[PDB]
DNA sequence: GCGATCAGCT
């Protein structure tokens, strides 16, 4: 896993906060999930911060709004610049301890992962670097980003630092965002037109990403989405205006510890069996990756898992096809993986990356 | 009381 530091750029550190990153002279947040926020609470970290006031955290606008409504994070209230997605923006790196000043500049790019989540393409005196962070991008969608081009042709960048999550051509194909969202439309749709006491529980874990499928849900079915607590979206009206904490919805994504134990029981993790003293029908759909192999006998996004039960593919990050072609057309000199998964080894991961790059 | 680690479990 990606310890914080780019061999280019080591006097920054991106999404990584403990041991050696307690001595950068800037801090990155590419998005707000718990795995990328390591270190960021740790109580020598704020000490440090109320020694070095020029030590700064920079982020998007809304990575930026979803970390100070958590309270472990208030801390950081004044010491988090948000710079604008697309928005090429030159900081000053100045070290507290020899005065020694660099100027770097940073792009942030949408990451298609969970809002707020941007990649970070640095531009300084030791090359271009791309750190991607977690990104979903479908086929292409390198070649249509403008800010990664100079003169209509791709920059040169020395080192892309990649999410690496499903780099294997065992995950060669993920079913697209769209007949992700097409598929769970579709079956919340035939359940709960059937009667007012027809309800759907969205069993999705506990982290920013699934606000896409909820904004979707509720456009297309006229229908706000039941969650626990909405409070980190109170100044985003985009996503805000889809959810409620009003339980008198036949759409629920809210969660209890026994979720699991009140679904058997024919009970919504919100408490209720029944609206009017009548009891509700429930299905459980359960966000689920799922992946094809290249022979492209791809199967139904919506699988079926017992008598009110489904799964329905979504994916937080790309597939082995999307990875490729991502870094095929970016033909850096370095990829990195962000990540080891559990099931393969660093040697066959850069066995992947290494002719996807220069020679 | 809190943090960091992990079994256990979604
Ligand atoms: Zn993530
Ligand atoms: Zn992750
Ligand atoms: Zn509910």
Redesign the pocket.
Known sequence: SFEGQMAEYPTISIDRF?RENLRARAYFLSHCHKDHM??L???TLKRRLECSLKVYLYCSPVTKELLLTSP?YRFWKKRIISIEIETPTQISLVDEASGEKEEIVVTLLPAGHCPGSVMFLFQGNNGTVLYTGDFRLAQGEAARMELLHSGGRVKDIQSVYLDTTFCDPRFYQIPSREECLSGVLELVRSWITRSPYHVVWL?C?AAYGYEYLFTNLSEELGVQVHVNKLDMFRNMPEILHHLTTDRNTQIHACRHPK??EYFQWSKLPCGITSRNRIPLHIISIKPSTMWFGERSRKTNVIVRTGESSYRACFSFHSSYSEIKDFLSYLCPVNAYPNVIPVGTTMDKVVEILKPLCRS
């Open positions: 403990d390591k270190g609470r740790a109580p472990k069993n874990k979720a699991e």
